[PDB]
Amino acid sequence: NFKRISYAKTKTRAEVRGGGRKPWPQKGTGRARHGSIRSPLWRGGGVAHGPRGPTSYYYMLPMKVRALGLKVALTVKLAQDDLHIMDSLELPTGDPQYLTELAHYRRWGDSVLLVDLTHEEMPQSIVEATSRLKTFNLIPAVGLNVHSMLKHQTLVLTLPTVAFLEDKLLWQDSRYRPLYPFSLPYSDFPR
Amino acid sequence: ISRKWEKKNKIVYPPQLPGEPRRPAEIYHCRRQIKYSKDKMWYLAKLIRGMSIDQALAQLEFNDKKGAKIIKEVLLEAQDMAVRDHNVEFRSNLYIAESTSGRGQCLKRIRYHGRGRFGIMEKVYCHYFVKLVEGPPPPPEPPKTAVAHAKEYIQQLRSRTIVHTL
């Protein structure tokens, strides 16, 4: 919901074209009293309380809350036998059929989320194998998120990825409050 | 719009067993978009309802209403259709089983009144439906007699029990 932008928008009685003239005199006609033909009561008029897009639903959770969710998400994967640690993503063959058969033998699940340390160091064996697949996704370490892990049944991590996560996640548990945003130079940041 | 009356002439029953009795013929015919009032047309359909095919034509021939001539043309082509297509032996051995009128699509015109007023007047159209069944018309129901009333009243006194008890 934080990056959702609703583009739905309706025209109120002030934006419907025409309808500036009072149809009939207030009294004597024996009909209901109206001031315009574009009021919400009329057919073809404006909407009283409609969407007024574009609308943003952007909000930011505290940094420690967003970082804590990853730890809880990782705990669920390991506790439920859905987290697997690897040394490297180098496949013997680039055939995507090999990857599907390998995951079925070990009974990983219908969907597996593959995580690598960086985007430039991803082996071509796994990149060409996951390119033709839909349930096997290859993402970098920085692309890790709760929604992707919860959607997928099985999570696969490399050894460099595990070391990367601990440095990033445990850094929130022991740190000062930011005097200025961490994008600016610090004594010990980046690690 | 609905045109189920025409489709009622396309239903074919399975062949009858030798022990089964003779099934009277059923003919469904109608005319659409008749420039006539369904309220006025009802009295013409009610008049010939239950009459024989020949007796109905006698009433409609000397009737002064405009729809009487319209209904007569419907019966004449339905009587011909019965023998020609529905395997009816005697064209006079028919009686009007169902005879009713239905509302048709009506245009809307404006009738001008005084003081710049107006009133929407419709050009009423109506349908006429007729059903023909082979065989003599059923005899009219005799008026209920005193014996039947006495029989019913005594029967009421015999069916009463002691209520709100065991």
Binding site: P25 | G116, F118
Partner: peptide, 15 residues
């Protein structure tokens, strides 16, 4: 007690 006149309002002819 001013003279009260109500001008009739015609409807569109297309109906």
């Amino acid at each position: 007690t001013k003279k009260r006149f109500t001008p009739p309002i015609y409807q569109p002819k297309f109906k």
